[PDB]
Amino acid sequence: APDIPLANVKAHLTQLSTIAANNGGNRAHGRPGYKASVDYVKAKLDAAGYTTTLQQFTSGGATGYNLIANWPGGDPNKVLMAGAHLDSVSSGAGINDNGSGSAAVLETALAVSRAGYQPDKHLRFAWWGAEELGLIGSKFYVNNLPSADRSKLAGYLNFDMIGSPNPGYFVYDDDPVIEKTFKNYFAGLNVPTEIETRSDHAPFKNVGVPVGGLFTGAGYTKSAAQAQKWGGTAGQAFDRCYHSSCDSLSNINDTALDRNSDAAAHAIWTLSS
Ligand SMILES: N[C@@H](Cc1c[nH]c2ccccc12)C(=O)O
Ligand SMILES: N[C@@H](Cc1c[nH]c2ccccc12)C(=O)O
Ligand SMILES: [Ca+2]
Ligand SMILES: [Zn+2]
Ligand SMILES: [Zn+2]
């Protein structure tokens, strides 16, 4: 896999921050900052050669969108998916929650094209709408994916909050092959991980698609033991600005964002061979 350039990921976050500022301070479902987020991500993907789909739904009286990006080629009967919700809550720009996951997934999809990669499995990336309303966009996608296409899914990888300023390194304990691929990447860095103990992998998991993912923590408090193994501040939240107006460009730990973006690409390459 390539090394995902941290600066490229950070630059997507800067664009999402500007989009929030230009649209009432947020990127929330039913508000213009969400669709403007979608348009930015879509234009990058289209220019890199993806076949993109805007999947529209209505929730709460307002139009929502999922953005689906298929990399042409690969075995149609073995599809590997990776995704991240692209909506924020309306209190702020949602840069860690979940610009961080959205930017890592986008930069990994751009890296495929830059590398001239031809994965054996077909790759499909997704940016979900309306996750903050209760997984509405990912539930819509799974509910509208015919069973014949569901059965073609080899896995779904989810990235929701991966740049927390006081981070832990959590790996979902779901499908064993996906979990081992992420833990192998962190082992090469000599960075320990813990099992993740309510995001867009749930609708996939619940219909038997193998899932996994990465998370750096939200409102819970970092323990003494976690500060000893990962650094940071014991007794403070992993993300002190969770769902807050302060979930801004300042609310990112660059090392966590870099490690989780690189791990995302590692798993996507490994699992699509
Ligand atoms: N889905 C949550 C974030 C979150 C909290 N705890 C998690 C555990 C795993 C994955 C995601 C989470 C949100 O968007 O605010
Ligand atoms: N995100 C920076 C820390 C930081 C907070 N606010 C900043 C403003 C400018 C530059 C860096 C920062 C890091 O992870 O090291
Ligand atoms: Ca990197
Ligand atoms: Zn989230
Ligand atoms: Zn959230």
Swiss-Prot record:
UniProt record, GO biological process: proteolysis
Cofactors that this protein relies on: Ca(2+); Zn(2+); Mn(2+); Co(2+)
Cofactor note: Binds 1 Ca(2+) per subunit. Binds 2 Zn(2+) ions per subunit. Can be replaced by Mn(2+) or Co(2+) which results in altered specificities.
Residues reported in the UniProt entry to bind Zn(2+) 1: 85, 97, 160
Active site (record annotation): 131 (proton acceptor)
Top-level taxon of origin: Bacteria
UniProt: Ca(2+) binding residues: 3-4, 258, 262
Temperature dependence: Stable after heating at 69 degrees Celsius for 5 hours.
Keywords carried by this UniProt record: Aminopeptidase, Calcium, Disulfide bond, Hydrolase, Metal-binding, Protease, Secreted, Signal, Zinc, Zymogen
Location in or out of the cell: Secreted
Known catalytic reactions: Release of an N-terminal amino acid with a preference for large hydrophobic amino-terminus residues
Practical applications according to UniProt: Sold by several companies as an extracellular extract called Pronase.
Regulation: Calcium activates the enzyme, inhibited by 1,10-phenanthroline, EDTA and EGTA. End-product inhibited by L-amino acids. Non-competitively inhibited by NaF and NaH(2)PO(4).
One term of GO molecular function: metalloexopeptidase activity
Chain positions recorded as Zn(2+) 2 binding sites: 97, 132, 243
Disulfide bridge partners, by residue number: 241-246
Enzyme Commission code(s) on record: 3.4.11.24
Site feature (Transition state stabilizer) residues: 242
Assigned GO CC terms: extracellular region
Family: Belongs to the peptidase M28 family. M28A subfamily.
SUBUNIT field: Monomer.
Miscellaneous section: Most experiments use protein purified from a commercial source rather than protein that has been overexpressed.
Protein role: An exopeptidase specific for larger hydrophobic amino acids (especially leucine), no cleavage occurs if the next residue is proline.
Name this polypeptide is given: Aminopeptidase S
Originating organism: Streptomyces griseus subsp. griseus (strain JCM 4626 / CBS 651.72 / NBRC 13350 / KCC S-0626 / ISP 5235)
Source species taxonomy: Bacteria, Bacillati, Actinomycetota, Actinomycetes, Kitasatosporales
